[PDB]
Write a protein that binds this DNA or RNA. Structure first.
Ligand code: MG
Ligand code: MG
Ligand code: MG
Ligand code: MG
Ligand code: MG
Ligand code: MG
Ligand code: MG
Ligand code: MG
Ligand code: MG
Ligand code: MG
Ligand code: MG
Ligand code: MG
Ligand code: MG
Ligand code: MG
Ligand code: MG
Ligand code: MG
Ligand code: MG
Ligand code: MG
Ligand code: MG
Ligand code: MG
Ligand code: MG
Ligand code: MG
Ligand code: MG
Ligand code: MG
Ligand code: MG
Ligand code: MG
Ligand code: MG
Ligand code: MG
Ligand code: MG
Ligand code: MG
Ligand code: MG
Ligand code: MG
Ligand code: MG
Ligand code: MG
Ligand code: MG
Ligand code: MG
Ligand code: MG
Ligand code: MG
Ligand code: MG
Ligand code: MG
Ligand code: MG
Ligand code: MG
Ligand code: MG
Ligand code: MG
Ligand code: MG
Ligand code: MG
Ligand code: MG
Ligand code: MG
Ligand code: MG
Ligand code: MG
Ligand code: MG
Ligand code: MG
Ligand code: MG
Ligand code: MG
Ligand code: MG
Ligand code: MG
Ligand code: MG
Ligand code: MG
Ligand code: MG
Ligand code: MG
Ligand code: MG
Ligand code: MG
Ligand code: MG
Ligand code: MG
Ligand code: MG
Ligand code: MG
Ligand code: MG
Ligand code: MG
Ligand code: MG
Ligand code: MG
Ligand code: MG
Ligand code: MG
Ligand code: MG
Ligand code: MG
Ligand code: MG
Ligand code: MG
Ligand code: MG
Ligand code: MG
Ligand code: ZN
Lengths: 100, 112, 91, 50, 77
RNA sequence: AUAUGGAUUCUUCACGGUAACGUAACUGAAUGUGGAGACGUCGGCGCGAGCCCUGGGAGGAGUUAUCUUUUCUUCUUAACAGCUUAUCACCCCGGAAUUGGUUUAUCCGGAGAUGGGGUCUUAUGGCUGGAAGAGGCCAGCACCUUUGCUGGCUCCGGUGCGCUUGUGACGGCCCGUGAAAAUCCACAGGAAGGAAUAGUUUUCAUGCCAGGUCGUACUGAUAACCGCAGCAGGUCUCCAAGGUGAACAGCCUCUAGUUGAUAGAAUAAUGUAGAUAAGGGAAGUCGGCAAAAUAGAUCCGUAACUUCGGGAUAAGGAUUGGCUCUAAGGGUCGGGUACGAUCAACUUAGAACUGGUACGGACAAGGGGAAUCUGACUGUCUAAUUAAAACAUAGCAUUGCGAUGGUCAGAAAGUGAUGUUGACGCAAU
RNA sequence: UUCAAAUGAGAACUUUGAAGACUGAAGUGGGGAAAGGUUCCACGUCAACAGCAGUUGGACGUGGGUUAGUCGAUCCUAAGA
RNA sequence: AUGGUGAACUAUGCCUGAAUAGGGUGAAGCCAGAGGAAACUCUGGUGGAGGCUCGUAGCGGUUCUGACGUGCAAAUCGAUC
């Protein structure tokens, strides 16, 4: 009745082209993700990590993949990376950042 | 928002032109024409919808196994059973009284 | 709480037609809509249905009767006259 | 219209064949005198009166 | 237009004189709540009705498909 | 057209149920009879469908100086078939005053209520078949091409004086009581035909062949029709989103569709159409013609007269925004034979604070009053100069007539209207 | 109503992209009855016609297009004939 | 004068169809209650009556003696009704 959901994003394809910094990026998530209504309250309820080439999110609080696309769109817009990279579902809940 | 058209050349709102909006596998709304409704057959004695008998527009009763058009009793698919009850009772009793009417005035003639 | 001093069911007709006329109607309207005792089964369930026709709620008997009331004063004397005359023929 | 009798479909169809201009080869025959088609008809100029 | 469940009645259908062809269908679905499972409908086509027998058990299906008359025209998937 | 399977029969034309009735079937001539075809309008109330609104999740898109777990959008399921599903109606048990049951709407019962237990109609709905293979949304590879090729996802819910339509059980109305026939079924009847060495059975299932003829385009209107025309006129109907609001009003929007109507430059007089105007307030004029004023809703307040129904929104008043709070009004469950737990609604009254005293802030929306004349009223007419006091009307009264008749039609008639008629009628004033 | 492109001898008026608006679901949306009869669609295309224009059209030339056991007719009866 | 043709407009009857936003009023019937010695009288509800009323669509056509009056139009257009 509690449930713990995970969210994978392959940030490789734009990371390798230099114009992407999974460092300050996962940092964007890590403190602008809303947790019963405000930033930071990720109170061991949600986690963000990086696999160097992959971002991981695991939640226990209300957090949907539509949210996860909303935030990165915002990060990707905050640093001018629109035009260059899209957020995309590859398989269900498996996302990635497509370059070209 | 999704509107709809008649499916026949008749454009007027009559009893033989009733519509019914419907969602197809296509995801579109569509008119469907609806046959007039069936009404229940009735007791030719008391007048009620006579129970146990199926109901469909008249010619459709010729496309139906005989059991749908009857119940298993005297005067089955035709009178309401409480009607049958009645006309059995009255039959018996009047047929009986006929005996009481005859032999009684058979005495009248003999005692006159 | 009483709604009308006098016009009763006739109160639909507002101000129209003239008082006198409303009265004549009201008398007869009260007669026609009223609920009547059944000679046959004995419940007060005879209600009218178009002039002349009087039919029992339950038991479904229908008597022919007055236009606005079940039994015409006339007809009922007639019922009795025929009584009288009939009687003579056996006795 | 929109749901017509075969009688009327005909006249309609007959009237469609009569609605061509002169066959110009006629223009060339000896003594030929017909300049143009003087019996032409338009749907929005003369009504067929059935 | 007709559904079937007797896996004996089914077999006899497929040997009817008018039953020319049949088709076998495979849906991935899910069980109770926890997980999925492979469903299989056995549609036979009569001159006036398509009888279809759903077999919810993967095992029963593999044995059934061999019971099929070799003179029958089966459309797989 | 018919053939196999099943059903039926040695108790020949089935069984089961106390019964309403059940069913895969379970013979039926003449003849009779019953039903369905098959029927007004309004009102509320109940339910269905489609639409509207809305939570979570999975997708794609939009905005991101800033803010928004955001804005927008996809998430669908036909006829037909199986099972199941109903208000109504009815059956069995039983026997009712301390009368009970009961609708929003006061009806029901010793001609058997309340109670318990069953039976039917299948409108309608549910799950399965059809049927995911279709459709809808995406991503991931290919190449001048036909155009592919490969993957996914297509899930779970909420709400109701909502809107539209369908439908049921009821109620009101009538000197109005609101088609017909083709056609289909049933039952009463029982002429007849039919089994044991094998009959009867095509209203049960399955199976075979066949279905002609004519119309099918498009416009349906500020250009496809009628008005001499691509005419500001006329011309019968179905479908119907969000906001505000009482609303199918007005005003703004989504979807779809338009962006058609000669154009350019100026802005004299006089216009047509839209507006404002100090002080006065009808002095203008035949005449307040035109114009102005009023207006919603809540509360208060309301005269003569009256056929007692009205007159009445009479008249006359006050109030109204934003925002912030308080109170009242409901559903669902388990309680031995007082309360606890959650879910989902705009209404209505109140109290703070707030502003250049404004708030039905656009849109929308009655001027009132006292008399005289005249017609009672609603209703009708001179299409194209008269809408009225003129016609009609109920009401009142008079006349004719009992059918071999009144009144009226025709050249005639073995002719016709009233007449499917009968003085509570038809005809004539 | 506007800017551009394209087309063409020629573009205020055609096509396309952009912009601004409109009708506002009692529609300038989606369909039909009566009536019209090919106007429907495509290609070609401007002499006349569309009260300015024209490369555009309901115009002109030349072709193509209307598929039914189940939608209508056909059958039934209505006032009437 | 004679013999013919019209009810596609319109008048009236019949037959068979279709159509009408939202409001105001609150008539019979019904329920509960109050007073009164009695006869009887009052209050609150519920209910949804009417050739009733406000007003769109509809139908009509009052005024401007408005527009137009070689018209959009051989009867239209606007506002008002
Ligand atoms: Mg059609
Ligand atoms: Mg109707
Ligand atoms: Mg018909
Ligand atoms: Mg039965
Ligand atoms: Mg049945
Ligand atoms: Mg049996
Ligand atoms: Mg009959
Ligand atoms: Mg009948
Ligand atoms: Mg009818
Ligand atoms: Mg939607
Ligand atoms: Mg069907
Ligand atoms: Mg019960
Ligand atoms: Mg029982
Ligand atoms: Mg309610
Ligand atoms: Mg409607
Ligand atoms: Mg009736
Ligand atoms: Mg029947
Ligand atoms: Mg059969
Ligand atoms: Mg033949
Ligand atoms: Mg068509
Ligand atoms: Mg069309
Ligand atoms: Mg057009
Ligand atoms: Mg014309
Ligand atoms: Mg002409
Ligand atoms: Mg015109
Ligand atoms: Mg169009
Ligand atoms: Mg012009
Ligand atoms: Mg000019
Ligand atoms: Mg002044
Ligand atoms: Mg003054
Ligand atoms: Mg003065
Ligand atoms: Mg003066
Ligand atoms: Mg004067
Ligand atoms: Mg004077
Ligand atoms: Mg005035
Ligand atoms: Mg002023
Ligand atoms: Mg007076
Ligand atoms: Mg007054
Ligand atoms: Mg205030
Ligand atoms: Mg509360
Ligand atoms: Mg509560
Ligand atoms: Mg008058
Ligand atoms: Mg006149
Ligand atoms: Mg004249
Ligand atoms: Mg008038
Ligand atoms: Mg006039
Ligand atoms: Mg008088
Ligand atoms: Mg003669
Ligand atoms: Mg232009
Ligand atoms: Mg353009
Ligand atoms: Mg607009
Ligand atoms: Mg509107
Ligand atoms: Mg137009
Ligand atoms: Mg035409
Ligand atoms: Mg042609
Ligand atoms: Mg064209
Ligand atoms: Mg030219
Ligand atoms: Mg032209
Ligand atoms: Mg020109
Ligand atoms: Mg020219
Ligand atoms: Mg052509
Ligand atoms: Mg048919
Ligand atoms: Mg035929
Ligand atoms: Mg006519
Ligand atoms: Mg209304
Ligand atoms: Mg009002
Ligand atoms: Mg009203
Ligand atoms: Mg007392
Ligand atoms: Mg009312
Ligand atoms: Mg009225
Ligand atoms: Mg009025
Ligand atoms: Mg109003
Ligand atoms: Mg009008
Ligand atoms: Mg009128
Ligand atoms: Mg006018
Ligand atoms: Mg004038
Ligand atoms: Mg002039
Ligand atoms: Mg008006
Ligand atoms: Zn009775």
């Amino acid at each position: 009745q509690k449930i713990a959901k995970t969210f994978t994003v392959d940030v490789s394809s734009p990371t390798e082209n230099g114009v992407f910094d999974p460092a300050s990026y996962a940092k964007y998530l890590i403190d602008h993700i809303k947790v019963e209504g405000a930033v930071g309250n990720l109170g061991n309820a949600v986690t963000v990590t990086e696999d160097g080439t992959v971002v991981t999110v695991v939640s226990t609080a209300k957090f949907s993949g539509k949210y996860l696309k909303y935030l990165t769109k915002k990060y990707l817009k905050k640093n001018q990376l629109r035009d260059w990279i899209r957020f995309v579902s590859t398989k269900t809940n498996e996302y990635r950042l497509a370059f070209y | 928002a999704q509107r709809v058209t008649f499916r026949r050349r008749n454009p007027y709102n009559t009893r033989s032109n009733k519509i019914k909006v419907v969602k197809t596998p296509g995801g579109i709304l569509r008119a469907q024409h609806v046959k007039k409704l069936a009404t229940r057959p009735k007791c030719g004695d008391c007048g009620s919808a006579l129970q146990g008998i199926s109901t469909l527009r008249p010619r459709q009763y010729a496309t139906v196994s005989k059991t749908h058009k009857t119940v298993s009793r005297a005067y089955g698919g035709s009178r309401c059973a409480n009607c049958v009850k009645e006309r059995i009772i009255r039959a018996f009793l009047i047929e009986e009284q006929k005996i009481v009417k005859k032999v009684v005035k058979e005495q009248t003639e003999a005692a006159k | 709480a009483k709604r009308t001093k006098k016009v009763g069911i006739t109160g639909k007709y507002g101000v129209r037609y003239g008082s006198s006329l409303r009265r004549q109607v009201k008398k007869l309207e009260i007669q026609q809509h009223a609920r009547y005792d059944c000679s046959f089964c004995g419940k007060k369930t005879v209600k009218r249905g178009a002039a002349g026709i009087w039919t029992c709620s339950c038991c479904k008997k229908t008597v022919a009767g007055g236009a606005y009331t079940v039994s015409t004063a006339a007809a009922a004397t007639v019922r009795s006259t025929i009584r009288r005359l009939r009687e003579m023929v056996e006795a | 219209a929109a749901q017509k009798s075969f009688r009327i479909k005909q006249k309609m169809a007959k009237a469609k064949k009569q609605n061509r201009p002169l066959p110009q080869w006629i223009r060339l025959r000896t003594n030929n005198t017909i300049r143009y088609n003087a019996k032409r008809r338009n749907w929005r100029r003369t009504k067929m009166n059935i | 237009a007709r559904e079937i469940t007797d896996i004996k009645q089914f077999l006899e259908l497929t040997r009817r004189a008018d039953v020319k062809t049949a088709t076998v269908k495979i849906n991935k679905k899910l069980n109770k709540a926890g997980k999925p499972f492979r469903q299989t409908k056995f549609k036979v086509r009569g001159s006036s009705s398509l009888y279809t027998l759903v077999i919810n058990d993967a095992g029963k299906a593999k044995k059934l498909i061999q019971s099929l008359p070799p003179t029958l025209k089966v459309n797989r998937l």
